[PDB]
Amino acid sequence: QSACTLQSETHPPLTWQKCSSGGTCTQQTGSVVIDANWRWTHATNSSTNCYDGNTWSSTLCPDNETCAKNCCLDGAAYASTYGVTTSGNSLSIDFVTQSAQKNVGARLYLMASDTTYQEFTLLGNEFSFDVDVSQLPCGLNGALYFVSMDADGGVSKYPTNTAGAKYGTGYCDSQCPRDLKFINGQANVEGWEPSSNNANTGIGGHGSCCSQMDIWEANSISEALTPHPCTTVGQEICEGDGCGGTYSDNRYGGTCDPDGCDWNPYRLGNTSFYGPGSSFTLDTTKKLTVVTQFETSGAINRYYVQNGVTFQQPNAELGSYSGNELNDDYCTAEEAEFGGSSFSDKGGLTQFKKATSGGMVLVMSLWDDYYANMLWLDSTYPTNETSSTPGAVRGSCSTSSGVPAQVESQSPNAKVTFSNIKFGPIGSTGNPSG
Ligand SMILES: O=[N+]([O-])c1ccc(O[C@@H]2O[C@H](CO)[C@@H](O[C@@H]3O[C@H](CO)[C@H](O)[C@H](O)[C@H]3O)[C@H](O)[C@H]2O)cc1
Numbered sequence: 001q002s003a004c005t006l007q008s009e010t011h012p013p014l015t016w017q018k019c020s021s022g023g024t025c026t027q028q029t030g031s032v033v034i035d036a037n038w039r040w041t042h043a044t045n046s047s048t049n050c051y052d053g054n055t056w057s058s059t060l061c062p063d064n065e066t067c068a069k070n071c072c073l074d075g076a077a078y079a080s081t082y083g084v085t086t087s088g089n090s091l092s093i094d095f096v097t098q099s100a101q102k103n104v105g106a107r108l109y110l111m112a113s114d115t116t117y118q119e120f121t122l123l124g125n126e127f128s129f130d131v132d133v134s135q136l137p138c139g140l141n142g143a144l145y146f147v148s149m150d151a152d153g154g155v156s157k158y159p160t161n162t163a164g165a166k167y168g169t170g171y172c173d174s175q176c177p178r179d180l181k182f183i184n185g186q187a188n189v190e191g192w193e194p195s196s197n198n199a200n201t202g203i204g205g206h207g208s209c210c211s212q213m214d215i216w217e218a219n220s221i222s223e224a225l226t227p228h229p230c231t232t233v234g235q236e237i238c239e240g241d242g243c244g245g246t247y248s249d250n251r252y253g254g255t256c257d258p259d260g261c262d263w264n265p266y267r268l269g270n271t272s273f274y275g276p277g278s279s280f281t282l283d284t285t286k287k288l289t290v291v292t293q294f295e296t297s298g299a300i301n302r303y304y305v306q307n308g309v310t311f312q313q314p315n316a317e318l319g320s321y322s323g324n325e326l327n328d329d330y331c332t333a334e335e336a337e338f339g340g341s342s343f344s345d346k347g348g349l350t351q352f353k354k355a356t357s358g359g360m361v362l363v364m365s366l367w368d369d370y371y372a373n374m375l376w377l378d379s380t381y382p383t384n385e386t387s388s389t390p391g392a393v394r395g396s397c398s399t400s401s402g403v404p405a406q407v408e409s410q411s412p413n414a415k416v417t418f419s420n421i422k423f424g425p426i427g428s429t430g431n432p433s434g
């Protein structure tokens with residue numbers, strides 16, 4: 001797609017800290033940009049939509065190439081359309097925003113310049129942020145994560161994409177998402193099927209795969225940390241069901257691991273660690289700090305800080321595994337105890353380290369789940385299981401929770417706030433900000 005300018009594009013500024021081994025931190029100035037899927041897509045020479053509801057224009061978009069030639073992405077009114085605001089080092093995303101139309105959530109990338117994404121090399125480093133999940137009920141996911149996206153949003157590889165990172169192009173993740181309207185500088189109208197339960201979305205013939213570090217997927221009830229490897233590390237197109245991922249026939253039939261090696265303390269047995277109020281170790285009614293450390297072995301370490309008290313990731317015992325480091329032994333024990341082989345089939349933490357060795361883009365989002373109602377995060381899943389099934393219970397939410405239309409109607413003012421991002425060598429991000 002190209003870019004149009006019927007609507008100006010002004011990326012909300014966002015600062016973050018780059019810390020160094022010598023003990024100091026230096027303020028960085030970036031901005032956030034919304035993913036292309038949320039934008040108005042229209043004809044280059046008029047205001048006629050190329051996409052509306054969950055249908056492509058059959059005249060403007062008879063095939064993927066013609067559609068991309070005929071159509072452009074336009075600018076975003078971040079606050080008034082999308083409920084996205086920033087202030088200094090803080091980013092807030094509202095759940096439902098009513099303007100001329102209804103908007104649900106957002107997916108945002110951290111920029112280096114107004115035309116390029118910020119890349120981070122996670123291996124050897126740590127990432128810290130503060131979050132307020134107090135206004136996230138059952139069924140919602142305020143997510144902070146990394147994906148192996150190109151810094152230019154795909155432009156250098158696909159010159160029919162002239163919109164680029166400035167307009168939030170080039171997304172990929174470990175679900176090999178097929179809901180994307182543009183992939184690799186062409187539309188995704190070929191094979192498009194509207195979603196049965198979402199008036200605004202569908203599934204096309206192409207998807208976009210890459211490695212994904214899910215640092216944080218959470219609401220006020222549950223949280224999870226999940227690396228997802230792929231057989232090809234970086235962004236790559238996939239074809240149809242061959243994509244695998246959540247929305248293909250066989251989620252396991254593609255090049256990415258859609259499940260991951262997940263660590264949810266509640267799922268692992270500690271039902272008192274994270275939740276709303278003073279009966280939990282971490283009180284999700286209050287802001288908390290989350291630190292994630294990528295040691296060079298390929299293992300992942302985690303600690304939390306709230307009100308000046310520090311907690312390592314709680315210990316878990318699972319099969320022959322015991323500890324609090326997300327390592328090969330944990331991931332292996334998890335497959336043995338809970339079931340499945342997706343993570344190991346895609347090459348495990350060894351394959352994952354090939355991603356964290358290179359650059360990844362920071363993503364912050366807020367979403368509800370039109371596939372599984374977020375039950376995999378915060379409830380019992382599958383819903384016919386009981387606590388006697390290892391790993392079935394992931395949080396205290398009812399198995400009836402998280403129906404998108406219901407939570408959108410009941411909790412439209414839900415929101416997440418991410419703030420105080422700090423990045424640098426392991427051991428550095430707790431030092432004084434600059
Ligand atoms: O315990 N404290 O509260 C405490 C201890 C040490 C300390 O040191 C000062 O830290 C600040 C912030 O990290 C340093 O400033 C930064 O230095 C950077 C050096 O590359 C760069 O110039 C940054 O822009 C600047 O903010 C400062 O030099 C330390 O003395 C502060 C508080």
Ligand SMILES: OC[C@H]1O[C@@H](O[C@H]2[C@H](O)[C@@H](O)[C@H](O)O[C@@H]2CO)[C@H](O)[C@@H](O)[C@H]1O
Binds near residue numbers: 175246258262376381
């Ligand atoms: O449902 C989408 C969700 O799946 C996660 O994976 C689940 C998987 O669905 C389930 O069958 C298994 O028992 O538990 C896995 C871990 O919760 C992914 O972690 C997540 O990315 C979503 O894609």
Ligand SMILES: *[C@@H]1O[C@H](CO)[C@@H](O)[C@H](O)[C@H]1NC(C)=O
Binds near residue numbers: 315
């Ligand atoms: C949960 O984790 C906290 C923090 O490590 C610990 O103090 C507490 O004993 C754990 N509780 C259970 C039930 O595992």
Ligand SMILES: [Co+2]
Binds near residue numbers: 206239
């Ligand atoms: Co094709």
Ligand SMILES: [Co+2]
Binds near residue numbers: 297299
């Ligand atoms: Co270690």
